Design a protein around this ligand. Structure first.
Ligand SMILES: Cc1cc(/C=C/C#N)cc(C)c1Nc1ccnc(Nc2ccc(C#N)cc2)n1
Ligand SMILES: NCC(=O)Nc1ccc2[nH]c(=O)[nH]c2c1
Ligand SMILES: [Mg+2]
Lengths: 556, 412
């Protein structure tokens, strides 16, 4: 006997105040019982389970399933009840690696660890909770009772405990072999390196020897598995990666569910295929939720779809990360709140692509959206590469400076350079900081009756220009905007506007270039045509001249 | 030695807080620091049976070549029991803010000499993440009192009192106040003498059984404030008068006696914004009466230790920031303004982060607690950048203002 190091057990507890499962065992056919007896007999021989006495109060149901078409039975224990009662664990495999963060490898070998998979010992004190019963033939004898000595398949703590145990075993090998990488997925280990094939092969044997110290055998028969690997929806190749094939279906009629599937594929595709757009297609999914309901595709959605098909016509691949080179991120505006980006090191070879969509809200502008896209790409890049890319942005340096210096919020974007690739992000208007000499002064107001919803909006000016418009189906807030709109509409290229509306100031000081409000949009259109606009606020009902007059007129 | 038992408040589990993404340089720094700490027995690796997490990162303090581990214990601190039994409270010295110089020392390293209660250690779990999650995050918990944790100053307090005994009896005028990992030492004496006494204080800690060398000098007696002030002008435009009436209307929510009636009538008629309006003598009297009112303190302003402090900040432009600290609206316990630079001239977010730190420091000196911030910035922008500029060993609470305040105008 060659002594092996034991694997230390992780201490496990039930959730506070909870006891173990007591669940009735289903009756089974005579054939299932016999097959389970045989399976458990074998498992018992290997030390995976042990027979127990009647004293253990616990039970979990056991099943037997024949695969599809076949004569072979396998044992399935239904752990649902025990899982509800088992403590939460630290889960490591959250946050899977992104292929674009991986490094190219000359060789990647797969090692079958299935032996270890079913061999990790279970905490001695927790074993009683895993009890199960094979029903007896005809129910004329007590059922055969067993509990697990090892991590059971399907138990809540099995994946975390297996991963942590394997990791601890592998740690010294990884540390003392900085020239390889090791990754564990299911019952396999993947070992890559850049070593010349002889040295690589030697590292693999050494790893097999290292694992032997815990008694973990790997088959002499070497893995049929070779690159490319199909993993987590990706194809990984030694020098490149892509997403697994994406084929958009041909359809005469589109179901809600069909459209959800389409968007899913497109979203998945967008991390490599540059320029993917989901806006119009996603719109069709609003409200509803009835899965089998068919929707007509709008002309816009048809167009988006056709554009996507073109983008998807042939395979595209990403390259891997070279830590010795800068990361560059370039962003383009696509229209309708849509933004697309590429991240690369060398020109024309992307590591990855992606998209950003405008956040929901009443009012917005391109600069805010661009800023949000930058922050998102920044955060994604920290995750994947541990660093911020240098940005190439379709906005002039002077535009950005004018923006951030005058914007009411603190705002910043990291190191970036202008790339001239229309459409450019620009400021459509900027209001004056001081009142304009020589420019006509419009005092605006509006009011509405909450009940009848009748209202008025208008202005009076220092030149004695005046307007009042009667309005139906309106609110006080709408009349306040309407009044500003009228002053813009009726003034020359330079204008001073005086309003008491805190609501309107709040919106305009947010500097929107687009709005869900038709009225805000009309105001923006008017601002764009002006040379100079000064907007001044005053408190209502203070006896402020020209403000009180117009207030009088618009009230009743 | 011989740990004090600690518990979470009743009906709550330990923190599970996601580790946020860390740069390569911060990860490398943390791996190095933690390897040493593990060697020193301060922390130990943990297993998958520990579900808990608290975020960690690393900072660079003022003029230093070395990273400092910073754990964000904000969630754990909320969930940790308040400290009552032996110490019922730390009545806050009101004299600290009056001192000519207050130096801030990082004393946090002293905490590592006290073992942490064995049943509570699991709640201190933290993770060093790996780039692109390529290798499993390195999981640790504390064996001793962690820096940044609420319980550490509470638990260490008896040791601290004994340590500083000879310095205090020797230096009776010197005010020493402790908040989290910081010690605040005030003195009214000459700055060269002050530094001498500070270095004298270091030795007490240094000579005992062991970023302490550092110090951060404040002069709270020079801390200024911002009364409401109105323009003094020879010629007022219609616009000037509108801005004045607007400012006075706002002020009248604070100071009740304020009147706009006479001033508002200067605006009679519909006039060009830039036209100059002579003040009527009744307008001048009203303005005069208003000025006098604004020279007085706000009425019924008092600090309540049972209530949160709230801090609002406005960007004034050109590196200028104004702020107010209050409990109830319109009762400001402190107002202030920073015209400062300290780099950051091209970076708004850096400036804001520095303002947040300064205001928190002022808050700690004055009330002995940190305020809750209302920050003029989008969540995503703040959350992406603030850790890059953070120099402080504590972190306050914040929320985000998405709607531009009209009152920025009146603090300008
Ligand atoms: C995450 C991961 C998944 C698999 C495999 C999962 C599966 N199935 C295999 C390995 C070795 C890794 N780990 C790492 C770490 C750093 N660089 C790389 N680069 C890299 C990986 C695979 C190929 C290929 N072909 C090329 C380069 N892999
Ligand atoms: N006085 C009006 C005005 O300066 N408007 C304006 C509009 C768009 C701009 N883009 C800039 O970089 N500066 C701008 C200024
Ligand atoms: Mg009105």
């Amino acid at each position: 006997m060659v002594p092996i190091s034991p694997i230390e057990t992780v201490p496990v507890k039930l959730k506070p105040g909870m006891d173990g499962p007591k669940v009735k065992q289903w009756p089974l056919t005579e054939e299932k019982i016999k097959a389970l007896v045989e399976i458990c007999t074998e498992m018992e021989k290997e030390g995976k389970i042990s027979k127990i006495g009647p004293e253990n109060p616990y039970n979990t149901p056991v099943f037997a399933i024949k695969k599809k078409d076949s004569t072979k039975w396998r044992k399935l224990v239904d752990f649902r009840e025990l899982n509800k009662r088992t403590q939460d664990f630290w889960e490591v495999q959250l946050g899977i690696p992104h292929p674009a963060g991986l490094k190219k490898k000359k060789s990647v070998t797969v090692l079958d660890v299935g032996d270890a998979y079913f061999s990790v010992p279970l905490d001695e004190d927790f074993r009683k909770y895993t009890a199960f019963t094979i029903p007896s033939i005809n129910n004329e004898t007590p059922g055969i009772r067993y509990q697990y000595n090892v991590l059971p398949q399907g138990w809540k703590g099995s994946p975390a405990i297996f991963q942590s145990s394997m990791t601890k075993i592998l740690e010294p090998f990884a540390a003392q072999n900085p020239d390889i990488v090791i990754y564990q997925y299911m019952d396999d280990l993947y070992v890559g390196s850049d070593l010349e094939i002889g040295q690589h092969r030697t590292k693999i044997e050494e790893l097999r020897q290292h694992l032997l110290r815990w008694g973990l055998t790997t088959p002499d028969k070497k893995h049929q598995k070779e690159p490319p690997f199909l993993w987590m929806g990706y194809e990984l190749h030694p020098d490149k990666w892509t997403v697994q094939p994406i084929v958009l279906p041909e359809k005469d009629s589109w179901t809600v569910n069909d459209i959800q599937k389409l968007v899913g594929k497109l979203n998945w595709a967008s991390q490599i295929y540059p320029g993917i757009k989901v806006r119009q297609l996603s719109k069709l999914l609003r409200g509803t939720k009835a899965l089998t309901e068919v929707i007509p595709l709008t002309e816009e959605a048809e167009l988006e779809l056709a554009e996507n098909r073109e983008i998807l016509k042939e395979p595209v691949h990403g390259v891997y990360y070279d830590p010795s080179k800068d990361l560059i991120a370039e962003i383009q505006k696509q229209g309708q709140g849509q933004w697309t980006y590429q991240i690369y090191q060398e020109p024309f070879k992307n590591l990855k692509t992606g998209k950003y969509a405008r956040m929901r809200g009443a009012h917005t502008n391109d600069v805010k959206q661009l800023t949000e896209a930058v922050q998102k790409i920044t955060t994604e890049s920290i995750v994947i590469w541990g660093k911020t890319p240098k940005f190439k942005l379709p906005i002039q340096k002077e535009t950005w400076e004018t923006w951030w210096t005058e914007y009411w919020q603190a705002t910043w974007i990291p190191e970036w350079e202008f790339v001239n690739t229309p459409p450019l992000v620009k400021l459509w208007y900027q209001l004056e900081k001081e009142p304009i000499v020589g420019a006509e002064t419009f005092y605006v107001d509006g009011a509405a009756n909450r009940e009848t919803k009748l209202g008025k909006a208008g202005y009076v000016t220092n030149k004695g220009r005046q307007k009042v418009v009667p309005l139906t189906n309106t609110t006080n807030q709408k009349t306040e905007l309407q009044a500003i709109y009228l002053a813009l509409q009726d003034s020359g290229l330079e204008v001073n506007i005086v309003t008491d509306s805190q609501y309107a100031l709040g919106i305009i000081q947010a500097q929107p270039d687009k709005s869900e409000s038709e009225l805000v949009n009309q105001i923006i259109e008017q601002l764009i045509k002006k040379e100079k606009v000064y907007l001044a606020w005053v408190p209502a009902h203070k006896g402020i001249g020209g403000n009180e007059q117009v207030d009088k007129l618009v009230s009743a | 030695i011989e740990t004090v038992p600690v518990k979470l408040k009743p009906g709550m589990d330990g923190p599970k807080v996601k580790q946020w993404p860390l740069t390569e340089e911060k990860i490398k720094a943390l791996v190095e620091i933690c390897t040493e700490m593990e060697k020193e027995g301060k922390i130990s690796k943990i297993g998958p049976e520990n579900p808990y997490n608290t975020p960690v990162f690393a900072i660079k303090k003022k003029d230093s070549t070395k990273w400092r581990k910073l754990v964000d214990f904000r969630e754990l601190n909320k969930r940790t029991q308040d400290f009552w039994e032996v110490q019922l409270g730390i009545p806050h010295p009101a004299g600290l803010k009056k001192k000519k110089s207050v130096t801030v020392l990082d004393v946090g390293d002293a905490y590592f000499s006290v073992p942490l209660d064995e049943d509570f250690r699991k709640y201190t779990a933290f993770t060093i993440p790996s780039i692109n999650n390529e290798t499993p995050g390195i999981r640790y918990q504390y064996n001793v009192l962690p820096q940044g944790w609420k319980g550490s100053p509470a638990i260490f307090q008896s040791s601290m009192t004994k340590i500083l005994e000879p310095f205090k009896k020797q230096n009776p005028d010197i005010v020493i106040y402790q908040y989290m990992d910081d010690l605040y030492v005030g003195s009214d004496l000459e700055i060269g003498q002050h530094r001498t006494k500070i270095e004298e204080l270091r030795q007490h800690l240094l000579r005992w059984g062991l970023f302490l060398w550092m110090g951060y000098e404040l002069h709270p007696d020079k801390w200024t404030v911002q009364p409401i002030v109105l323009p003094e002008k020879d010629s007022w435009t219609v616009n000037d008068i509108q801005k004045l009436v607007g400012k006075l209307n706002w002020a009248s929510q604070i100071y009740p006696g304020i009147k706009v009636r006479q001033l508002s009538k200067l605006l009679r008629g519909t006039k060009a914004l830039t036209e100059v309006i002579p003040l009527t003598e009744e307008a001048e009297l009203e303005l005069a009466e208003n000025r006098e009112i604004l020279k007085e303190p706000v009425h019924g302003v008092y600090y309540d230790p049972s209530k949160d402090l709230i801090a609002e900040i406005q960007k004034q432009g050109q590196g200028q920031w104004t702020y107010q600290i209050y409990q109830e609206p319109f009762k400001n316990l402190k107002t202030g303004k920073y015209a400062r630079m300290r780099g950051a001239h091209t970076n708004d977010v850096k400036q804001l982060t520095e303002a947040v730190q300064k205001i928190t420091t002022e808050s700690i000196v004055i009330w002995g607690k940190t305020p809750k911030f209302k920050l003029p910035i989008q969540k995503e922008t703040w959350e992406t950048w603030w850790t890059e500029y953070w120099q402080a060993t504590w972190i306050p609470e914040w929320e985000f203002v998405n709607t531009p305040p009209l009152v920025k105008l009146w603090y300008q």
